[model samples]
Target chain A: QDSLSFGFPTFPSDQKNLIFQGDAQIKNNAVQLTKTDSNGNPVASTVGRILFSAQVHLWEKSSSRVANFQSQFSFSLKSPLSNGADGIAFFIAPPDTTIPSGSGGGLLGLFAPNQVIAVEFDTFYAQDSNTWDPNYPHIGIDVNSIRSVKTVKWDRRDGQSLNVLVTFNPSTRNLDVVATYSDGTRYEVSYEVDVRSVLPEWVRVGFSAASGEQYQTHTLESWSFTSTLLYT
Target chain B: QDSLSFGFPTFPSDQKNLIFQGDAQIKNNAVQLTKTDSNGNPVASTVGRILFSAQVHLWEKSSSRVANFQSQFSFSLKSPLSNGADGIAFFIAPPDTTIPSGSGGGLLGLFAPNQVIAVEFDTFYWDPNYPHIGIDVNSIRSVKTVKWDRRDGQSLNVLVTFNPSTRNLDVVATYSDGTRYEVSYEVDVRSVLPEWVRVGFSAASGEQYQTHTLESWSFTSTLLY
Candidate 1:
């Protein structure tokens, strides 16, 4: 079976298989993708990212075929203050991808210069001339740019348990996402883009989150990913 | 088995078995023990309580024996503003108990006049006190208090164990930020609560509003009779 499948019901105590950058850390047995003090207070102007240590085979070179994949994760986002800033995202990028400088806040740690396909749970709205964010919290599908190709409004409750599922169908080149709140409210968005055109055959899959002046903490409770190549 | 054990990983969609009083409601499939708007804003001066519909057997009259119990619940408390008022509690009270008059704020919905055994996750510092985890017996004032530096916006895990043989009750609380707090007290549960009792949660918000949520709960008890 030439397939890859891994799951983390809760983050393992030994984290050698995961890569953490910026302020991300393993806290309370979960991937905490933001900086917080010992007293559970959010540290402002922080950008954090955590990814699988090894690269995943996204496409086969000999057959010129892409792999079908599904990823699911549970997460929680909370802000001590009335206002929350920035957000979190699950992204696929090249093996050499790293945190870009000045990529905090609305950039969400994935800059336009990076070759990335990201599904963003954006909480903040940036009205600056340089950004194209909607006025409210939203889910966005971004391809190599901070400005999303497709977006949908998200009604998020503070500190509530949330789940997200992302699936890619290589035949149709369709990437689909569904975000569900604890109340069973689901928000879905999809985009059509071939991974071969945007990313390499082998890529890194992981999570990235950021906090701006109005601070918030992002936590990944559980995660699972599966990729299968069809031999026709 | 002469024992009782119930678990709610997430509160059920059909909530007929649960009794909600005052402001308590089902939100996000959890027992929300305070009033909040659709936008998740807390409503001020609210008192809420949610209990199992049937009474729990606390002691046996014939055997003169008590029950050893363990209760664990996950919860989240959040406030929009910097200051958080009131708090949440796990309590055991008489079967006839109800929300007392003027029991909002520091009272945490359980009045001094009512017979109650409570372990409080108190956030407000009433009487010039610091935020604390406290054990209350019958009265509102806690017999044992441990300083808790919990702020207003993270999820918390709490486990409470009570030994009828030793008359000891212990509580451990862990915050999502990875901080843990512990407190214990020795009390005769049979003396404070009736032989048959209602076991559940109580929460209140004063002028400075906050939302208290019970995410998951599991309880088990063994009768020594």
Candidate 2:
């Protein structure tokens, strides 16, 4: 079959085909992608990343063809403070990607010298002079840079279960995202980007999150991804 | 029964225990509480009112006891203009209540000379003010109001809770994007409403036209004597 698919309704004990870095761990059938202290409180100034172990065939170099992919996941962010620090992201980068140093906080552990495409669920409003963030709790589409090319105000409550769907169509070269809250509230944003120009033919797909002076627990409750490449 | 409760998941055609006045009608399994023209466009300078048929026992005169009640509803407001005019209100009024004249704009059709209490989801920026969720008592001006950033055509969730013991009427409005705005006002229902009162909804549109819809509603009240 020329198709690739995986679903993790709940993280298993063995955690097959998955790699955890920094503070990421499987807890209570979910991926805890941030550090929690002994008292179960979120720890500040931390970065966590979890990646699919196998490489994803993003494009074919010979044919110059890109694959269409879709992903869905449920997550929650809980903070003790008023505004949660930093946020989480779903990203695609080269297969050799690794957690970069000083990638904590607003970096979302996805900032590196290598090229990457990320959809960020950012919660903190970095000062206007320091970054391009639009107030607190917004969604951003990033192309190899911390500053986003597009962003939308995302209204959310602390510790609310939220669902996200991301779809990439190679034909139109559009990356579309929809974030839905538990109460059926939805926010959508779309961006046109040619992933083949930024990423290698083979890439790693994963989730990354971080916290700064203020912190919140980032948990991935369930996730699924599918990709297909047509052959003539 | 000491406890009274009713729910309308979707309005049926027969429309039992419900009364619609003025522009209100049952459309698409929901309550379309405003006027639409031949082309289905909203009409300007319109007012709509829908009320529960039976009167509610709000308070007991002999014992001087009040009832605690809660109501939840999902609604949508769509505007053809940049800012939707007027707004929608969940109101409590005297048993003889009727749609008041000249109540088509910010009055929300609940501004009769009679005593009334209302939780309004106001969209238009009257007096150049921001959109807001407000609590009104016998007045168009809100005693307590919270800023509500509403997007046109977005569905919203509203929850109203009244505690007789503390005389607190709390309102929370959640937008489709999960944004929430809350306001609480302390008022003794006995002071405003009679022992028997009517509870219902009122919506209006002025120069700018908009459609106000009620998707679902559930209400419960417990009389404490």
Candidate 3:
């Protein structure tokens, strides 16, 4: 697939190559996953997911086991309350045409067994008996499990802009994710992954979010990615 | 004088070469000009002003009439109340200066005769009497003005670019959430004052109380000494 770069994207009206489904809209180049409805009310039973594919092989069967990739993007989650509900995630999923269902709220709407590799910005309290989450907002690395293998509190109060960088190195078979807070603090975490063992050669790379009764609007302002990385 | 540039400044322990007066403090590289006091009582009886200058010549009188320069910075004027008083300015002023005295409130503590050239971010309003931004040459009379609403809780990004080659000065302000305002004025630097001028920022609060913070600052310029 060709390298993708959009600096505060302003897409054409047709937006033929971009995938927007389930309450997602591309307005003024910003991807609005969930917004206030008519009469100025928060979302109701909202599930929004957007995907863009490299349309190239993540793993070339004969040449390479996996592609080295880097992605950088800016996002914002706004809620009128001090505590906001639901969250958003960057995912690398198999090239399936269907999105996850019945997994809104804390799950971030991406529930399926061995469905995708997701890095989540979860802002809700612990939902189930599982006590892996803090009461406040946090970031997590999820591999086909709603329970994260890695998690850190997201301690930015301004809650206006969040900058994220995710990189995958084929040589080490590692995925590194870093988040830069509004106050200029940084939290970085990484995980080991064997992409060739989990999914197919071609995968969909994109963002997904959901809001339940307690709602917040999630926006992806800009996203840029390259399938090639200079890794030693 | 020589050209200078800083992507964003991080100060030494002593903060030498730069000046911080009044309520200003150097924290984590950026400058916080005004903040809550020990009791968080909005700095009672406050008539504070802070100034940060390069302490060097922007241009030399004998070598060049005026120097072309550009500066870009980000700041926030955060107030608990929507009606925030006073303001801040990007100024080119004379050498060896103290805070502009008895010049709080609308004056933004910048009352000197032919002593300063300033572009102001004015937040307080009197409806029919004032605008949000002003180009103050030699005084606070505002040769030019623009309507600006105070985004009290949001950080703003500002760019002030001046090109002596074209005699143009452009000012742009944007909210972190992507609201933008642009304004410009034309004034030859040589006509205003001597070429060897000092650059700094000054802010003030009168009766009203608010926290005004400067997040980051960087400038690019040609200099001669």
Candidate 4:
């Protein structure tokens, strides 16, 4: 029996729950990577990679498969550069232990090489720049995969914070990133990089975790997601 | 057997006075080279050189007996690498326009070659300490006929108002030169330099005015002598 709930092409029993704050708890079993595309059409490996940042801490039902990860910036079980609850990550593994990084690069080590695909929002940033071997707190999405990439910088007025919303246009090979500042101003940037063309296609996406030499503590704040569209 | 009620040290009946705001000004007076060193002071010179500075606007006086220039550094007009003004000077000269310096270094040119003893108060300054010309405004004293000298710096706060006074020292160097001004100081500064040492005479100047500036040190709002 095939049916759907939200605006998406398909929805599974494991994708119906909504959770926020703390560790991502397994409630609706396991996350099911959609068997079809958003247009209810079939897709293939040429469609490129689709990624969804994990909710810092939430719950899902059983019977759903978790996201998969590549070792470009894996935290694994190694020691982080520093031990503070640094921040969020673009993950592709089962939600569990808060992994940490080693001496030089910290949580950002989830992806050692930026040549792969990564969309980051750095909070506790140091001055590093290169992700291939670990770089600075670049603040924006580090795009070393693109040939003409330049260091990105951003700031917020006192008392005003910054938020970001990103959209990936696979057909057009464009990555659109929009930032909202506390002063009600919006700045948008686009990456002309093609994730599928740049890296292997079968990689899944979600979120990662970390702890460090100092506090070695962090919590996933909130997360909301719908069923993901997969390539045939 | 009797004397007239006259102020002992009065403005030269032969000198002109001026005030400086954005730049410098010179006064007129003193007979050319007529100044003689009597009191038998240590060094010997008949006053062939001349320099002077003042902050007041005097009228009708003309000669070489007295002049005052309030540079805004301890500067002697005859230094080799002339720099800035952090102090002021007083001068006695021959009755010639070629004696005192003009505005800026022009005043030093007033007595080229240190011929005139230009007393200066220098503030903004530096010192190479090199043998050539290292006279920085350390805030003390400087003389041309002598070597390069300096004095410490003083804070200049001119927005505040003040008053004037006169000389308490008797007319010892009188009977010859005919230049004068009202000079006084609530605070006393002792000159550590040997050249400023005086003879057996106890001489002093009245607190003339109170100004943040060396020239218009406005001691009072009233310009009365």
Docking tier of model 3: it is: incorrect
The parts of candidate 4 lying over 4 Å away from their true place are: A1-85, A91-105, A112-116, A124-137, A142-151, A155-162, A181-187, A209-232, B1-225
Say which prediction, candidate 1 or candidate 4, comes out ahead on DockQ.
1
Q: Model 1 Cα displacement at B194 (Å)? A: 51
Q: Over 4 Å off in model 2, which ranges?
A: A129-133, B1-225
Q: Give a tens-digit lDDT track for model 2, residues B105-180.
A: 8788877437889998888863357888888977545888887776777878889999988989999888866788
Q: Per model, how many backbone clashes are there?
A: 0, 0, 6, 109
lDDT of 1 by residue, B42-158 (tens): 879899998864456677664687888888998877888666878899999886788898888878998833678999988886235678888888974788888887566677889
Considering lDDT, where higher is better, how would the candidates rank from best to worst?
1, 2, 3, 4
Against the true structure, candidate 3 has what lDDT? 0.64
Better of 1 and 4 by lDDT: 1
Candidate 2, A1-232: lDDT as tens digits: 1234556666644454567988998776778788887766688888899987545677776556687889788888887888877888899988778889888887888884459998888887765723344565788888876457888878747788889998999988899999999888998889999888898877888899999888998888888777765432
What is model 1's interface RMSD? Answer: 21.1
Q: Assess the local accuracy of residue B32 in candidate 4 as a C-alpha lDDT between 0 and 100.
A: 19
Lowest lDDT sum, 10 consecutive residues, model 1 chain A, at A125-134
Computed on alpha carbons, the lDDT of every model, listed in order, comes to 0.79, 0.78, 0.64, 0.25
Candidate 3 Cα outliers beyond 4 Å, as residue runs: A2-14, A38-41, A127-132, A156-159, A229-232, B1-225
Maximum-lDDT candidate: 1
Estimate the TM-score of every prediction.
Answer: 0.49, 0.49, 0.47, 0.27
Q: Candidate 1 chain B, which ten residues in sequence have the lowest lDDT sum?
A: B1-10
**Tens-digit lDDT string for candidate 1 (A1-232):** 1244556667644454468988999877787788888877678999899877545667766567687889898888888777776788999998778899888877888883367899988888666523334567888888875467888878657788689999998988899999898777989998898888888877888999998777788888888777765433
CA lDDT, candidate 3, residue A111: 75
lDDT of model 4 at position B128: 30
Q: Candidate 2: lDDT of A67?
A: 75
